[PDB]
Amino acid sequence: MRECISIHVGQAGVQIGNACWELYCLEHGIQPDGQMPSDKTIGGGDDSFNTFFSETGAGKHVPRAVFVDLEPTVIDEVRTGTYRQLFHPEQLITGKEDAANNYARGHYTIGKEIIDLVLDRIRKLADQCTGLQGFLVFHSFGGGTGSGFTSLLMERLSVDYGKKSKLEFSIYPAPQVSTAVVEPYNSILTTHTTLEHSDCAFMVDNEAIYDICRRNLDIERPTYTNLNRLISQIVSSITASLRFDGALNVDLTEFQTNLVPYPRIHFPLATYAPVISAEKAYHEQLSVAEITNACFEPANQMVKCDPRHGKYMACCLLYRGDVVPKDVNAAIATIKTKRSIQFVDWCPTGFKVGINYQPPTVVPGGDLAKVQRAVCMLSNTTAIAEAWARLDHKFDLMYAKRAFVHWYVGEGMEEGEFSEAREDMAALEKDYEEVGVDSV
Amino acid sequence: MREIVHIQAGQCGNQIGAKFWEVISDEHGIDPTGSYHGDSDLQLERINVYYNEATGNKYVPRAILVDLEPGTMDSVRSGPFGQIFRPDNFVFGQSGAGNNWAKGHYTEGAELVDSVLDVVRKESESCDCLQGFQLTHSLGGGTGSGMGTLLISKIREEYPDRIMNTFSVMPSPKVSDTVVEPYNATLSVHQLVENTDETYCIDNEALYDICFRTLKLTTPTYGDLNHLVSATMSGVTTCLRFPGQLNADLRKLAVNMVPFPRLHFFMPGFAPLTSRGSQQYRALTVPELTQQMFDSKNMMAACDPRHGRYLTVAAIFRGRMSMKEVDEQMLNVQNKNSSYFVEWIPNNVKTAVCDIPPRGLKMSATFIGNSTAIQELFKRISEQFTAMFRRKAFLHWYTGEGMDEMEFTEAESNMNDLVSEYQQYQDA
Numbered sequence: 002m003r004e005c006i007s008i009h010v011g012q013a014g015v016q017i018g019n020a021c022w023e024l025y026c027l028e029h030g031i032q033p034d035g036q037m038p039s040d041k042t043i044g045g046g047d048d049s050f051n052t053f054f055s056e057t058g059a060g061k062h063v064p065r066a067v068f069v070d071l072e073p074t075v076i077d078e079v080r081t082g083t084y085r086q087l088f089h090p091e092q093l094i095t096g097k098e099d100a101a102n103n104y105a106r107g108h109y110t111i112g113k114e115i116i117d118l119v120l121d122r123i124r125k126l127a128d129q130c131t132g133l134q135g136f137l138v139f140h141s142f143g144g145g146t147g148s149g150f151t152s153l154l155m156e157r158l159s160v161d162y163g164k165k166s167k168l169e170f171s172i173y174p175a176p177q178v179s180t181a182v183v184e185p186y187n188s189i190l191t192t193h194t195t196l197e198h199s200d201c202a203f204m205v206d207n208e209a210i211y212d213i214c215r216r217n218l219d220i221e222r223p224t225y226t227n228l229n230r231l232i233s234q235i236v237s238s239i240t241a242s243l244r245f246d247g248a249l250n251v252d253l254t255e256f257q258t259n260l261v262p263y264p265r266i267h268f269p270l271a272t273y274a275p276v277i278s279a280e281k282a283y284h285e286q287l288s289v290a291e292i293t294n295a296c297f298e299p300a301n302q303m304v305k306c307d308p309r310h311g312k313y314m315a316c317c318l319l320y321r322g323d324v325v326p327k328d329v330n331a332a333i334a335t336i337k338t339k340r341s342i343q344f345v346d347w348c349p350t351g352f353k354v355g356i357n358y359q360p361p362t363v364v365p366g367g368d369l370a371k372v373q374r375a376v377c378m379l380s381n382t383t384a385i386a387e388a389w390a391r392l393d394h395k396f397d398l399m400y401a402k403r404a405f406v407h408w409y410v411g412e413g414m415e416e417g418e419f420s421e422a423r424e425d426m427a428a429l430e431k432d433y434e435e436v437g438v439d440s441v
Numbered sequence: 442m443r444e445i446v447h448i449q450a451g452q453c454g455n456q457i458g459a460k461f462w463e464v465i466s467d468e469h470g471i472d473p474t475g476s477y478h479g480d481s482d483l484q485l486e487r488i489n490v491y492y493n494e495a496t497g498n499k500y501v502p503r504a505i506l507v508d509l510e511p512g513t514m515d516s517v518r519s520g521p522f523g524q525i526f527r528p529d530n531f532v533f534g535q536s537g538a539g540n541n542w543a544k545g546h547y548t549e550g551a552e553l554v555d556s557v558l559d560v561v562r563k564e565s566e567s568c569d570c571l572q573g574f575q576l577t578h579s580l581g582g583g584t585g586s587g588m589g590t591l592l593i594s595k596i597r598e599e600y601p602d603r604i605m606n607t608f609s610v611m612p613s614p615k616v617s618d619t620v621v622e623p624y625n626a627t628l629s630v631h632q633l634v635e636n637t638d639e640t641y642c643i644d645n646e647a648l649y650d651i652c653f654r655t656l657k658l659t660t661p662t663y664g665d666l667n668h669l670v671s672a673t674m675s676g677v678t679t680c681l682r683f684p685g686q687l688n689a690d691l692r693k694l695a696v697n698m699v700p701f702p703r704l705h706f707f708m709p710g711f712a713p714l715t716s717r718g719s720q721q722y723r724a725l726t727v728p729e730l731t732q733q734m735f736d737s738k739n740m741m742a743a744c745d746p747r748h749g750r751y752l753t754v755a756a757i758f759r760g761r762m763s764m765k766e767v768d769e770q771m772l773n774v775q776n777k778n779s780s781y782f783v784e785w786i787p788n789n790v791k792t793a794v795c796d797i798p799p800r801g802l803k804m805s806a807t808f809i810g811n812s813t814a815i816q817e818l819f820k821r822i823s824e825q826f827t828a829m830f831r832r833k834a835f836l837h838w839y840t841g842e843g844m845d846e847m848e849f850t851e852a853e854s855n856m857n858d859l860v861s862e863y864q865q866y867q868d869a
């Protein structure tokens with residue numbers, strides 16, 4: 002059973018949703034009409050891919066997914082595009098007026114108009130599940146809907162589903178592709194509001210992804226399409242354990258046990274390899290040792306920060322494709338006598354390893370080479386707190402002058418929600434410092 | 442007394458449990474159908490200990506299979522000896538225990554435990570004279586560990602005059618699934634100390650080392666580890682299964698092995714150490730069996746026997762050999778090393794011989810020792826527990842299921858008491 006429901010919120014959530022679901026379809030041999038020839042059990046089944054797809058009597062495999070945006074134009078592209086037969090119209094929800102880059106509008110003014118309808122559509126997906134495991138929420142930090150609506154939705158899901166797990170894929174803002182001056186405000190308000198409602202959150206720094214695209218894929222000026230294809234590869238690696246099975250497969254929930262030592266310390270660093278162009282992959286096979294090594298190169302991280310300057314509390318390696326434990330252990334033993342890997346004194350140092358045998362797929366017309374083996378490392382490092390320190394600094398510069406604050410107050414918010422959200426962030430930065438101090 | 446009821450719980454429990462039934466079934470001449478196709482009468486004389494007869498004449502394992510997930514039990518059912526188990530003895534939930542002792546013991550396990558006890562009762566009622574129970578489980582996960590020890594508590598309430606024994610797999614960082622294994626192990630030991638009569642400590646550290654250092658397998662799998670477990674298990678239950686004088690039932694084993702009620706954690710040993718598939722052609726001499734079975738490198742618990750003293754030892758020799766040579770070699774070991782056997786328990790080493798060797802060997806020896814060196818195993822778990830527990834790390838997985846920190850403090854203190862109680866007798 003073990004179903005997962007995906008919720009894609011706002012432009013970034015939705016566009017990343019497109020990329021992930023296209024890729025999932027290719028990974029499982031599901032066609033744009035939902036038909037999957039290799040699936041012999043029509044209208045149902047308890048296979049691995051059923052965690053992510055339900056099945057209709059007519060053989061259609063349907064994403065367990067809701068797409069929500071406060072404006073209609075990004076979702077209209079899903080409605081008229083390649084994969085439009087994949088989704089029932091009721092899974093794609095749009096309003097008319099967006100949150101205009103304002104958290105208050107996404108959370109209150111505009112978002113309160115559509116929240117009951119969204120929870121009803123989510124309820125309809127949940128009711129089709131025999132053993133619902135939980136939710137994956139995709140959104141930007143910076144957008145009005147991605148921040149304000151997501152935080153409203155997470156709060157309401159805590160009410161309606163209790164402690165049912167909620168995981169986030171959160172797009173952390175970068176100056177190269179950002180669209181609002183107020184993204185630091187929106188980021189702090191959403192982070193403070195959702196912190197108690199979320200079990201695990203994978204931050205994806207748009208600048209780390211932009212850099213990887215420029216540097217590893219030789220893309221002069223990466224677009225959202227470039228970034229999203231790469232993000233989907235990383236999301237796919239994380240969810241692969243839920244969607245496939247095999248002997249050495251290790252469930253995401255079991256990695257989570259190792260990854261979250263205290264409820265607030267729930268932001269793993271993802272690093273992915275190999276990211277390589279077709280031109281450079283040709284005649285050059287990357288071995289297990291090469292890809293595992295690339296995991297400890299900071300230029301390969303999804304968040305810009307330096308783990309060499311903090312401490313590890315956990316380390317997980319999720320391999321996919323042509324990989325055996327013998328080679329993994331050899332590669333790990335090499336790295337241990339050669340890299341800057343220091344653990345806190347209160348946690349053991351062994352790496353946790355899972356292997357899915359199904360190799361990575363790429364989307365037609367994309368930039369990544371088809372490789373035989375790939376790895377996603379998920380680590381829990383105190384270095385992730387640097388990403389908070391940067392956003393908090395940006396927040397403080399503007400907030401000391403109350404720059405743009407009238408836009409939020411005009412929508413019904415008080416200054417006390419700002420200082421309160423900021424204090425929680427200071428306490429979070431402090432928490433990360435304290436977990437890295439040696440024991441008495 | 443005859444009948445033993447076997448319970449296997451969780452992924453590890455059910456994987457070693459399936460192998461056990463596979464190995465002992467082949468020794469008793471029972472095939473996947475449940476049909477006897479063997480030559481000797483020694484094979485059937487005490488078959489009722491482990492098997493029910495249902496007219497056929499077919500033999501059905503007195504075995505209850507328990508998990509909170511269906512996965513590993515579907516694996517068992519479509520496995521080699523899968524058809525032999527009574528389908529009604531399969532008891533499973535859907536939600537799993539997430540390597541969490543609190544879920545196995547208090548929340549998810551509580552939901553499933555009554556159904557298990559219905560199956561236990563149904564099996565217990567067909568018994569002329571139930572001896573008691575054996576459980577196979579690990580201590581590092583959530584189901585075998587948390588729910589397994591819940592079951593033991595409830596079985597003891599309903600059958601307080603029966604023997605309870607366990608094959609308990611201890612976790613190691615060398616072969617590890619999660620960081621919380623020391624938490625789960627410490628909470629389980631606390632239970633085992635109070636509610637079992639006899640516990641075979643199967644140390645995943647030791648099994649790993651034997652596979653790596655001795656069997657020259659550079660990367661051991663669970664399969665390799667379980668081959669050692671199923672050989673040890675076949676060995677320790679030989680005196681229960683075949684016509685024989687001493688340690689012939691579960692209570693007599695307890696009476697000879699356990700001088701003080703809390704000190705009932707045994708180190709098993711096996712010789713010769715063999716890997717899967719790859720056969721050895723030269724049989725061992727009785728002097729070689731006897732030397733190897735006592736060697737630290739043949740111990741299934743990573744404790745140095747020279748760091749403690751033996752309270753009691755049971756030794757089982759299997760195959761056609763000279764019983765006079767066995768007595769002599771057994772006597773030679775003790776006389777040579779007498780300072781390692783406590784002098785205040787006279788004649789604390791008992792030896793049994795059985796004619797039937799295990800599959801693929803002409804000669805074998807199994808060692809069961811109650812040594813005060815076992816304390817090293819508990820010290821190791823204690824160290825791992827404290828490293829985390831002093832920063833309360835990972836505790837939210839447990840408080841979220843209703844547990845308080847006090848329960849951890851108590852379980853730790855009781856395990857430290859057990860350690861120092863072993864040290865008391867190592868110096869007396």
Ligand SMILES: Nc1nc2c(ncn2[C@@H]2O[C@H](COP(=O)(O)OP(=O)(O)OP(=O)(O)O)[C@@H](O)[C@H]2O)c(=O)[nH]1
Binds near residue numbers: 144175
């Ligand atoms: N990686 C990635 N980031 C995106 C994408 N679209 C927008 N973003 C980032 O998300 C932030 C802007 O928020 P959006 O998601 O566009 O805004 P929204 O949630 O639609 O909110 P409103 O439009 O204000 O109602 C900026 O940091 C963008 O760079 C995308 O397709 N991929």
Ligand SMILES: Nc1nc2c(ncn2[C@@H]2O[C@H](COP(=O)(O)OP(=O)(O)O)[C@@H](O)[C@H]2O)c(=O)[nH]1
Binds near residue numbers: 579581583584618663
């Ligand atoms: N020796 C051995 N240990 C195992 C096996 N499977 C799991 N383990 C160990 O058992 C512990 C995890 O418990 P497991 O039985 O998988 O979890 P459960 O199903 O919740 O009881 C860890 O210490 C693993 O190293 C096995 O087949 N053999």
Ligand SMILES: [Ca+2]
Binds near residue numbers: 042056
């Ligand atoms: Ca199907």
Ligand SMILES: [Mg+2]
Binds near residue numbers: 011072099144146
């Ligand atoms: Mg928008």
Ligand SMILES: [Mg+2]
Binds near residue numbers: 452453582618
């Ligand atoms: Mg397991």
